[PDB]
Amino acid sequence: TKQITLYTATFSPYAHRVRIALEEAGAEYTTYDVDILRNMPDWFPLVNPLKKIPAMTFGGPEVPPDQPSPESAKIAESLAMLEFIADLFPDAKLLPTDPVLRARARTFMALYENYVNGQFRDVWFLGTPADPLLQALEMLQGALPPDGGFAAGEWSIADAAVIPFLARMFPYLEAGLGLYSKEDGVKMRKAMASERFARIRQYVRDCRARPSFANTWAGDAEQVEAAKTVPMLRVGEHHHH
Amino acid sequence: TKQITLYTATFSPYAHRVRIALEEAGAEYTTYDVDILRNMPDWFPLVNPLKKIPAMTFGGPEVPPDQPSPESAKIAESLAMLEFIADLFPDAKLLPTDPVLRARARTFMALYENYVNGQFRDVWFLGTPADPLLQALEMLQGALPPDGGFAAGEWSIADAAVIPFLARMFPYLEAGLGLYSKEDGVKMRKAMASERFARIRQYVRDCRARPSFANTWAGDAEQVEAAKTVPMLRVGEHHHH
Ligand SMILES: N[C@@H](CCC(=O)N[C@@H](CS)C(=O)NCC(=O)O)C(=O)O
Ligand SMILES: N[C@@H](CCC(=O)N[C@@H](CS)C(=O)NCC(=O)O)C(=O)O
Ligand SMILES: [Ca+2]
Numbered sequence: 001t002k003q004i005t006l007y008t009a010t011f012s013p014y015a016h017r018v019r020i021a022l023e024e025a026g027a028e029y030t031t032y033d034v035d036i037l038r039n040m041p042d043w044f045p046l047v048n049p050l051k052k053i054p055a056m057t058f059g060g061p062e063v064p065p066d067q068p069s070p071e072s073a074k075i076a077e078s079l080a081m082l083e084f085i086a087d088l089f090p091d092a093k094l095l096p097t098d099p100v101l102r103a104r105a106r107t108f109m110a111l112y113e114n115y116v117n118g119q120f121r122d123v124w125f126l127g128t129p130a131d132p133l134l135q136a137l138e139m140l141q142g143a144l145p146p147d148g149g150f151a152a153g154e155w156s157i158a159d160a161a162v163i164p165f166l167a168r169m170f171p172y173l174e175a176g177l178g179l180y181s182k183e184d185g186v187k188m189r190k191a192m193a194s195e196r197f198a199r200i201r202q203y204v205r206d207c208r209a210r211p212s213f214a215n216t217w218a219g220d221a222e223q224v225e226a227a228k229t230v231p232m233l234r235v236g237e238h239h240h241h
Numbered sequence: 242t243k244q245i246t247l248y249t250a251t252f253s254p255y256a257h258r259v260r261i262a263l264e265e266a267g268a269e270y271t272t273y274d275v276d277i278l279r280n281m282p283d284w285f286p287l288v289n290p291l292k293k294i295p296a297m298t299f300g301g302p303e304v305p306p307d308q309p310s311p312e313s314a315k316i317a318e319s320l321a322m323l324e325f326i327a328d329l330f331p332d333a334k335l336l337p338t339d340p341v342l343r344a345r346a347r348t349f350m351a352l353y354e355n356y357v358n359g360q361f362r363d364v365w366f367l368g369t370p371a372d373p374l375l376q377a378l379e380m381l382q383g384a385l386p387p388d389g390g391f392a393a394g395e396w397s398i399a400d401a402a403v404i405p406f407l408a409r410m411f412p413y414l415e416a417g418l419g420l421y422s423k424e425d426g427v428k429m430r431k432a433m434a435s436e437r438f439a440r441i442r443q444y445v446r447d448c449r450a451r452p453s454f455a456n457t458w459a460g461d462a463e464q465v466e467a468a469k470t471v472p473m474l475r476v477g478e479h480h481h482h
C-alpha cells in the first residue's frame with residue numbers, strides 16, 4: 001500500500017527499466033518527469049543525492065513529487081529498483097522461483113551491465129569503434145535460450161533491464177543519432193539486420209510486444225526526438241578511427 | 242546435495258567476493274585455482290566462455306574440477322553468484338528480509354560497481370589522478386549507516402561484494418603496487434588515514450574481523466605477492482602526471 005514515486009525522463013533507458021518492471025508488477029505508482037540534464041530542480045538532491053534519473057521514493061505521507069518528504073525511503077540505482085519491485089510484488093513472479101533460473105536472470109543483467117552497456121555509451125556518446133559493441137551484443141545474444149523465450153525462460157526483470165537499450169538501438173541508428181562515424185553507422189545497421197543477429201531481433205520483438213513496453217514507450221519517432229534533447233548527443237559531431 | 246565448485250585465484254577480488262559469501266552461507270564447496278591471466282587451461286572455456294574468474298559449476302556428477310561435466314550448470318559473474326548463494330541458503334540470511342533493507346544492499350553493490358570500481362581501475366592500472374577515486378570512496382562511505390554496522394545494517398552479500406576491493410587497497414598502497422606515482426600514493430595513504438575516511442576504516446575493520454574474511458585471505462603480504470603476478474599491475478612501473 002506504501003506509495004511509489006518514480007522520477008523519470010522519456011529519453012532515459014535507466015528509468016525505462018523501472019517503468020517496465022512496475023507495469024509487469026501491476027503496481028500503483030506515480031511518475032514525475034525531471035529535466036535532469038538541462039535544468040535540475042533545486043529539490044531533486046533530496047530524492048537522489050547522486051543527482052541521477054531514475055530516483056524512487058517509497059512510503060512516507062502522500063505528497064506532491066516536487067515536495068518530497070524526508071520520511072520516504074530514497075532508493076537509487078535502476079537495477080536495485082528492479083530487485084526491489086520483485087521483492088515488493090512476489091505474486092507477480094518478476095523473477096523465477098528456481099535458484100538456477102534466477103541466476104540466469106542475474107547473470108544476464110551482469111553481462112549486459114558489465115560488457116554491453118559501456119560499449120553502447122562509448123559508441124554513442126564518444127564515437128568509439130563499433131566492432132567491440134557488436135562483439136558484446138553477440139556475446140549477450142549467446143546467453144539467450146536458443147529456441148525463443150526471455151533471458152531466464154519466462155519474462156523476468158532481466159528483460160526489463162536490457163530491452164530499453166536494445167529497443168533504442170534500432171531507431172537511433174536509423175535516425176543517425178550518435179557520435180560514431182558514417183562507416184560504423186553502416187556497419188552497425190548491416191550487422192543488426194544480418195543473420196548473425198536474428199536471435200536478438202526476435203528477443204527485441206518479443207519484449208516490445210508486451211504491454212509493459214507499449215505502455216512505457218513514446219513511439220520510435222517520439223523517443224528519437226527525446227534523445228535529441230540530450231546535450232552529449234552533439235548534432236554534427238563525429239569521431240573517426 | 243548439489244555440488245558447488247568455484248574456480249578461483251588468490252589475487253582476484255571478484256573471486257574473493259564469492260568465497261566470502263560461501264563461507265557466510267555455511268556451504269559445502271570446492272575451490273580450484275586457475276592461472277587465468279598467464280596460463281589458462283584449454284578446458285576453462287567449458288566452465289566460462291568469457292574466460293574470466295570466478296566461474297562456478299553447480300550440480301552434475303562429482304568430477305575433478307579440471308574435467309568439468311556438461312551436466313553441471315555453469316554460472317558466470319560474481320554478483321550473480323552472490324545472489325545465487327543467498328537463494329540457495331535462505332536460512333543463512335545473506336540478505337535482509339525487509340524489502341527496503343534489501344534495496345539498501347542492492348544499491349550499495351550498484352554504487353560500488355558503477356562508480357567506485359572503475360576509479361580503482363583508472364588509478365591502479367593507468368595511474369590517473371587519485372582525487373576522483375577519493376571522491377567516489379567518500380560517496381560510497383556516505384551510503385553506510387554513519388553510527389556503525391554493515392551496508393544494509395546486518396551483514397549481507399553487499400559486504401561480500403565490496404570488502405575484497407577495499408581490503409586490497411591498504412596493503413597495495415603500502416607496497417606501492419599500481420601505476421600511480423609515489424606522490425599520489427602518499428596522498429591516498431594520508432587521505433585513507435585521515436578523519437575524512439574514519440567511517441570506511443571502521444567498515445573495513447568490521448568486515449575483516451569476520452571469519453569469512455580470515456578464512457579467505459592469504460594475509461596482507463601474501464596477497465601483495467599474488468597481486469604482483471597480475472600483468473596489468475605492472476610491478477615496478479609508475480606513471481607520472
Ligand atoms: N547507474 C544508474 C545510471 C543512471 C544514469 O546515469 N542516469 C542519467 C540519465 S539516462 C542521469 O541521470 N544522468 C545525470 C548525471 O549523471 O548527472 C542507474 O542504473 O540508475
Ligand atoms: N564482471 C566479472 C569480472 C571478473 C573479472 O574480471 N575477473 C578477472 C580476474 S580479477 C579475469 O578473469 N580477467 C581475465 C579477462 O578479463 O580476460 C565478475 O564480476 O565476475
Ligand atoms: Ca548459448
Ligand SMILES: [Fe+3]
Nearest residue numbers: 011012013014
Ligand atoms: Fe542517459
Ligand SMILES: [Fe+3]
Nearest residue numbers: 252253254471
Ligand atoms: Fe583482476
